[PDB]
């Protein structure tokens, strides 16, 4: 028992040294907190990630069905990256992006770099060039499936080289990302093998149930599970709301997590905070916090402090 702890501590340290920090973790371990991360838009997800946002200088996968919210999540990283004076890029093999929607999440679309590559290799190459610049805070790739290799686009037997395309590229890219401190997000749709292992974070995104404003639908309750996490104990999940035309309810997530942490208290349907009241029913509380950014920030401030915060 007394020697065990010494021997196990040793083993973990050898492991932690011989391969990266986060090669082994107890699932109850406190997260090692970096200096800067990329907030996701949802405090719940930020907490589920352990480090209060997405890591910098790493590969990230966000995946799910069509109409999952995965892209929305990605665009908040993009918006937050910019919000902190960073420069963002978007490699587009889907041609689905809605910048009006993106603008209302908070993406500075005007200053967002975008590329619409011909081939899969070209896509990843451009990413790589853009990464090695070291001027880039984030780069999003939309999407994996659409990364069709040159040879296939020309007609040119060797089928399954789209994986070797990714493998080769990810090796080269993974090193480029670490030096620059740029994050790469690969959006990936369910309906590849390399990205699973190179990625430091993997997020499984799903649509749970539709939010209804009486007769009409105003959004969707979204669920995300961190299936892989090399920066903090994995398998955590968060729920939050994506509101049509607005995106992730930061206010709605602050309340959710506020009550969870006991910093917000219930008096029936009434949501209280520190003695003052926030509203009757979640919607009024949500609506109260958007009108009062100062109190919403105070709650965000307090949730972080009561755990590991970024500040």
From Swiss-Prot:
Pfam families: Intein_splicing (PF14890), LAGLIDADG_3 (PF14528), RecA (PF00154), RecA_C (PF21096). InterPro entries: AAA+_ATPase (IPR003593), DNA_recomb/repair_RecA (IPR013765), DNA_recomb/repair_RecA_CS (IPR020584), Hint_dom_C (IPR003586), Hint_dom_N (IPR003587), Hint_dom_sf (IPR036844), Homing_endonucl (IPR027434), INTEIN (IPR006142). Signal peptide: none annotated. Gene3D superfamilies: Hedgehog/Intein (Hint) domain (2.170.16.10), Homing endonucleases (3.10.28.10), P-loop containing nucleotide triphosphate hydrolases (3.40.50.300), RecA protein, C-terminal domain (3.30.250.10). CDD domains: Hint, RecA. It is found in: Cytoplasm. ATP binds at residues 64-71. PROSITE patterns: INTEIN_C_TER, INTEIN_ENDONUCLEASE, INTEIN_N_TER, RECA_1, RECA_2, RECA_3. Belongs to the RecA family. This is Protein RecA. It comes from Mycobacterium tuberculosis (strain CDC 1551 / Oshkosh).
């Amino acid at each position: 028992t007394p020697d065990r702890e010494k021997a196990l501590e040793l083993a973990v340290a050898q492991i932690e040294k011989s391969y990266g920090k986060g090669s082994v973790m107890r699932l109850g371990d406190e997260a090692r907190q970096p200096i800067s991360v990329i907030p996701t838009g949802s405090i719940a997800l930020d907490v589920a990630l352990g480090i209060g946002g997405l890591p910098r200088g790493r590969v990230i996968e966000i995946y799910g069905p069509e109409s999952s919210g995965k892209t929305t999540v990605a665009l908040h990283a993009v918006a937050n990256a910019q919000a902190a004076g960073g420069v963002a890029a978007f490699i587009d093999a889907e041609h689905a992006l809605d910048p009006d929607y993106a603008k209302k999440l908070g993406v500075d679309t005007d200053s967002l770099l975008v590329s619409q590559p011909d081939t899969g290799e070209q896509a990843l190459e451009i990413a790589d060039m853009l990464i090695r610049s070291g001027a880039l805070d984030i780069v999003v790739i939309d999407s994996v499936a659409a990364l069709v290799p040159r040879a296939e686009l020309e007609g040119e037997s060797h089928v399954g080289l789209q994986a070797r395309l990714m493998s080769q590229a990810l090796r080269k890219m993974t090193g480029a990302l670490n030096n620059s401190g740029t994050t790469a997000i690969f959006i990936n749709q369910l309906r590849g093998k390399a990205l699973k292992f190179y990625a430091s974070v993997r997020m499984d995104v799903r649509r749970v149930e539709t939010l209804k404003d009486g007769t009409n639908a105003v959004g969707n309750r979204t669920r995300v599970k961190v299936v892989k996490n090399k920066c903090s104990p994995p398998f955590k999940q968060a729920e939050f709301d994506i509101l049509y035309g607005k995106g992730i309810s930061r206010e709605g997530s602050l309340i959710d997590m506020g009550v969870d942490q006991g910093l917000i208290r219930k008096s029936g349907a009434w949501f209280t905070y520190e003695g003052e009241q926030l509203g009757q029913g979640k919607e009024n509380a949500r609506n109260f916090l958007v009108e009062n950014a100062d109190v919403a920030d105070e709650i965000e401030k307090k949730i972080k402090e009561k755990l590991g915060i970024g500040a």
